[PDB]
Amino acid sequence: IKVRENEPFDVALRRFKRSCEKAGVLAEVRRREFYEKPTTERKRAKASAVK
Amino acid sequence: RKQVSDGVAHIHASFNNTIVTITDRQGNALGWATAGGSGFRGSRKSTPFAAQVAAERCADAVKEYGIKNLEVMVKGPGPGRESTIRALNAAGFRITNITDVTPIPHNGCRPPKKRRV
Amino acid sequence: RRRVIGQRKILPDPKFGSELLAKFVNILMVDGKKSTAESIVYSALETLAQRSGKSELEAFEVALENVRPTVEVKSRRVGGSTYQVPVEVRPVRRNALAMRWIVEAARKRGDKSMALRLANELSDAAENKGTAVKKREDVHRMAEANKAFA
RNA sequence: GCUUGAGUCUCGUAGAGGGGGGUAGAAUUCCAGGUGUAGCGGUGAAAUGCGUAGAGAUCUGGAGGAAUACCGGUGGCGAAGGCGGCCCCCUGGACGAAGACUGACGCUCAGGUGCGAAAGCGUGGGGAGCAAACAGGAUUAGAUACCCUGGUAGUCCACGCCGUAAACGAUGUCGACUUGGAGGUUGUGCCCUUGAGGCGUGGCUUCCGGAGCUAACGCGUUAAGUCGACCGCCUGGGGAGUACGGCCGCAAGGUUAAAACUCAAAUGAAUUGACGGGGGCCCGCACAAGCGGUGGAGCAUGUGGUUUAAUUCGAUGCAACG
């Protein structure tokens, strides 16, 4: 993101910054979009959370 | 003839390749290098080691200008995305700014199906 | 397998004493003949000893500890590579690879007696030439030129 | 006649309700210009393709079309189909809250009318991306495919038309009732509201489960429970959702819908095993890691084939073949 280091180091980490982008946002868009498919799989995680 | 101490270090972290290009501050190209000059093919194009190979070639072709500040423009997935950052720094540049210009789908184009296997 | 492998005791050279020199007998064992082996060892040692400085243990030892690899390549689909990935080996297996290659190299000579063959080959190990060395220069060539994780 | 059914009115509630009209930014693309240079692109590898005629990348400017990252969720709304930026205008539905009127005005429905995703068809616009088709390249033995590079129609819009979809909660619609748990959402009354909150009472909505039902799986107060009202349909599979005709359609076909013949099942759910180039896990010289062979050569030895009057007979994937 446009978050940046405040003093010049390689200690400061930029895979922090892959927090808001590439987070369901990229690395799965390169496939054609069908309305059924992302709607269905969500219902798997709420048996998970209660159980 | 350009010399301004600062310039964007653009990096195109291609998921299939890695290009590294150092542009002026005003977006006027100065140097570039890639996996294909490094002497790689395949998905070997896209590794940390290989990214070093290009990041550093590119350094011999832009250092004589006198640039030594970075404005990192990480763009796309593609491993070896921070080898390059680190490489530059570790070779007479300094970090200043980590910026994002990265294409983000709003689905203003239609993505292909690609390989369905 | 359950647990991990044990170690197995091997006796060093009696006349000068170097485990590593005795692991060179092991490498030169064919027919099982350790007897007829203990000849060739000293036979190559002297050649070395005259022509070269250092110790007589470091006519072999050192000279070899620079034409031994530090990477071996196998492969597996773990890391997401279909390719031959470098592997920094334990220092003992470093030896084993080179020792082996050097011995193949003196049955590719017809330079009379596995003494005189293997002898002059090891003298050129410090001189860094001979097709024994060049195997390293093919492994490490692949690995670093076509790095695909590690 | 009566009001509690139903319905209207009133006052609000929230929402991707609809339709038309405006509009934004990102992104992709192209065009223009600059910079910069020998590759780019792709893949499992590659090649076609695209590069010195200066691409890719990078910046700057312009143009356009389509879609709206996040939001965003069994979240919400709609009768269903279905509906995503944002605004305006016109407008629909639901709900809740008080009361108030009307006075069974209702439910459902063969026929009929209306709504109907996508593709498609006509006419005119428009054309970014993707992509039937189509053309190379690749894979394979073949490959009119998966795979890669492109790319036309189309997708988009206006208007009309066709009316189909495992049109799916595979559950007709409406009403009436019957244990409960936990969650979502959305109103409202009340509580030192002395808590970010506590108790009620509704609307819509999911997951789970008792009884019960069912062949089981499960369904389970939004039923497949327990009832009713009316309608729709089914009546072995294959033949065949086809033919023939009628009807509708511009057409494609849709709509209605058989019979002969033919088979003894077809079918559902669940069990066990088996298998899976399924998944998870775990082993064995199974592999890796090594070291030595065989197959090359000759001979021994067995077999097959063939010949011979007989080449005695048996053994045949490992698990027959010194």
Q: CB–CB of B113/A31 below 8 Å?
A: yes
Q: How far apart are CA B71 and CA B3, in angstroms?
A: 16
Interface test with B, best of C75, C81, C146, C149 (most B CBs within 10 A): C146
Report the amino acid identity of residue C122.
L
Q: Which of residues 47-76 of B touch strand D (CB under 7 A)?
A: 75
Domain span at residue B74 reads: 1-117
Q: Give the residue among C102, C20, C117 at the shortest CA–CA distance from C69.
A: C102
A5 contacts: CB under 8 Å, gap ≥ 6: A12, B95, B98
Q: CB–CB of C121/C105 below 8 Å?
A: yes
Tokens of B16: 């299939």
Number of independent structural domains in chain B? 1
Q: How far apart are CA B2 and CA B62, in angstroms?
A: 11
Pairing outcome for strands C72-74 and B29-34: unpaired
DSSP C34: S
Radius of gyration of chain A (CA): 17
Pairing outcome for strands B29-34 and B19-23: antiparallel
First-last CA distance in chain C: 25
Under an 8 A CB cutoff, do A32 and B112 touch? yes
Q: How far apart are CA A19 and CA B117, in angstroms?
A: 30
Tokens of C95: 């030896």
CB contacts of B111 in chain A (<8 Å) are 29-33
Q: CB–CB of C47/C119 below 8 Å?
A: yes
Q: Give the residue among C73, C75, C91 at the shortest CA–CA distance from C83.
A: C75
Q: Is chain C adjacent to chain A, meaning 3+ CB pairs within 8 angstroms?
A: no
Question: Which pairs from B25-29 meet CB under 8 Å and 24+ separation?
Answer: B25/B71, B28/B2
Tokens of B20: 């590294």
Per the DSSP assignment, residues forming a β-bridge with B73 are B10, B99
CA A15-B51-C76 angle, 5° bins = 85
**C38 CA – D11 C1', rounded, Å:** 112
The data reach a resolution, in angstroms, of: 5.8
Q: How far apart are CA C121 and CA C101, in angstroms?
A: 11
Instruction: Give the rounded distance of the alpha carbon of B112 from its chain centre.
Output: 25
Q: How far apart are CA B114 and CA C127, in angstroms?
A: 55
Tokens of A5: 């280091």
Under an 8 A CB cutoff, do B44 and C145 touch? no
> What was the structure determination method?
cryo-EM
CA A26-B7-B57 angle, 5° bins = 80
Under an 8 A CB cutoff, do B104 and A21 touch? yes
Under an 8 A CB cutoff, do B77 and A15 touch? no
CB contacts of B77 in chain A (<8 Å) are 22, 26-27
List of chains touching C (3+ CB pairs within 8 A): B
